[PDB]
Amino acid sequence: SMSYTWTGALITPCAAEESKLMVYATTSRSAGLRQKKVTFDRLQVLDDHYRDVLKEMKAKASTVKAKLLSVEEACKLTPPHSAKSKFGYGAKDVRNLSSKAVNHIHSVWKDLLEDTVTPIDTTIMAKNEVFCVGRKPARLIVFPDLGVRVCEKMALYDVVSTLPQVVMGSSYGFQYSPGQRVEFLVNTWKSKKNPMGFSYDTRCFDSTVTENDIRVEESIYQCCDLAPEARQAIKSLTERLYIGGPLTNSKGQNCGYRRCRASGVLTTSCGNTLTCYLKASAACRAAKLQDCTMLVNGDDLVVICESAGTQEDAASLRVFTEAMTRYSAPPGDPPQPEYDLELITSCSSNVSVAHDASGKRVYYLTRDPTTPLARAAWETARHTPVNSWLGNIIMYAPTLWARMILMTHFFSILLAQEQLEKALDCQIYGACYSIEPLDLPQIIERLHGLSAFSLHSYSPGEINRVASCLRKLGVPPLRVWRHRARSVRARLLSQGGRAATCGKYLFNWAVK
Ligand SMILES: Cn1c(-c2ccccc2)c(C2CCCCC2)c2sc(C(=O)O)cc21
Ligand SMILES: [Mn+2]
Ligand SMILES: [Mn+2]
What we know:
Blueprint: E1 4-6, E2 23-25, H1 31-38, H2 48-61, H3 71-76, H4 91-95, H5 99-114, E3 122-126, E4 130-132, E5 140-143, H6 146-160, H7 163-168, H8 178-191, E6 195-201, H9 205-208, H10 211-221, H11 228-242, E7 245-248, E8 254-258, H12 268-286, E9 290-297, E10 300-306, H13 310-326, E11 350-355, E12 361-366, H14 370-381, H15 388-395, H16 400-417, E13 424-428, E14 431-435, H17 440-448, H18 460-473, H19 478-494, H20 497-506
Parallel strand pairs: 3-7
Antiparallel strand pairs: 1-8, 2-4, 3-5, 6-10, 7-8, 9-10, 11-12, 13-14
Helix pairs in contact: 2-12, 5-6, 6-11, 10-11, 12-13, 15-16, 16-19, 19-20
The structure holds the ligand Cn1c(-c2ccccc2)c(C2CCCCC2)c2sc(C(=O)O)cc21 and manganese (II) ion (2 copies).
Residues 201, 298-300 line the site of one manganese (II) ion (MN).
PDB class: hydrolase
Keywords: envelope protein, hepatitis C virus, RNA-dependent RNA-polymerase, nucleotide-binding, allosteric inhibitor, non nucleoside inhibitor, NNI, HCV, NS5B, membrane, helicase, hydrolase, polymerase, ATP-binding
Assembly: monomeric
């Protein structure tokens, strides 16, 4: 079946959007190009490898017990800036347990229990994201109304937060902080006698997810020991929402119909990760890969196994790809065997190595800095809700580029504007935090360890990547950042207190 059908009505913005300050932001103007790419017929043919892996996943899922959340619990766990309901209340009313919201949520719940067939309405919007130099079109986001979204937590929050780690174990990527993720990847790599690894990412993954895939996911959830109302709600959600439904634009027009994964539902991440794990584990068996270990984060897969030799390895990957494709998930770019862990990129990132103060080798997670730099650039001139700059500084604190460029430039600006003490909203790991810049040393220490303030002797390859990207983008070279940092550090130190703590920890590297 067609992943989507379209009426011709346009995907419309609900606010002024911005396409420029090179660096661009996606807008609804490009929605059409995305629509075209994401619209196609799915062919899927399952085989015994698939059935066998599924069986094993269900056996694990059958050891999980999950509860319903009360309306109140689901209200409190609703994010503060999520889109308001069409029924007269918003997130803040949900979070503060307003009778309007609570009564509507209860009525949505009752409807889900009493009707398991009527397709539920969704809104479709174009995502506004910043990229750098062609242009990629806007990604689409499909979500139901706020009341429905609270009900999804009621039925499934306890499931999505407990089940995936049980079914997928160490392969469930979302359990890992950056350093833990590296630790898993390095230990896996070092465990193989002659390691080979590869990344795979599916072309339009959400569009490739079929009705059957979504029903198989539901059948995994129903293996859990659940309350009878939960079972009914999960069924109803699956039939009325997850498998598909009508799409409405921001102006209330009907845009069409969805027969694939909606991107804006509670189960998107868990379900995509489970479905990718299922197809990829079965594809590892088809390909006959030896001593396979997988890491999955949605449709971002890394596989590390024992090499069977160069040509053998190249042929097995084609076999893996062929299996993935029969299962509905062809790659954007064909996977390539890698024999150096540093060269495997997944979730836009890769493992690299540096040295701590003692000279000990320390592995850490990095990435190509072009997008982070471009987003930081945007945020110097505009301003937004996520403050990706700050998020990158935190998640990529041990990297040469976050330390030399992002930390420097941003403290430079905070100092100049006297806003060291002003908290900033920052979206990280799906949550919105209010972060004070002076709190960074503690945050980084907790997330990455003290060695993050002491890494040196970066790998040549990583240093040259940073240098190249700066050259490509016309940003000053590393020597200038070091000079700037020495100045930033002196200034911080001059202020004493916590400002000095920042200078000392964040900018220890810039000292002579
Ligand atoms: C060009 N440029 C950029 C930049 C612009 C577009 C995309 C990425 C980085 C930047 C970004 C500014 C925000 C932090 C990362 C670098 C800077 S700083 C600078 C200077 O002369 O001091 C020049 C630039
Ligand atoms: Mn993909
Ligand atoms: Mn992906």
